[PDB]
């Protein structure tokens, strides 16, 4: 399948990302985490395809470790799931080459739907 792994600040929604993920395509999540630098140092450790990321974490946010993942050249999609209706930081994420910007407006099938067309 396509290898995920998913860092997100709040437990419930990661928690809840992390199972119906699985369900509502052909995914394997390999880390899971609400910590930006973990997900950084997950992400290198396992090599994942595809990484959901949110933005504002401790350690690192989404945008600082999608830079990372960038300047290293790594062959990972991302996409950056969040909150934030701010200009700001949807001009930060595409700057940064992010392969997809999701709002949490969007369901997870949504979500699903997006990760497949970023991966194919
Ligand atoms: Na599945």
Redo the contacts with the bound molecule.
Sequence with gaps: ?TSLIIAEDQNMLRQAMVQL???????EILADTDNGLDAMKLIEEYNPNVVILDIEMPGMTGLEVLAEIRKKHLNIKVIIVTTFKRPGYFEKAVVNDVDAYVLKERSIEELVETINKVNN
Aim: glycine share 12%.
């Design positions: 399948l993920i699985k369900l509502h395509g052909d995914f």
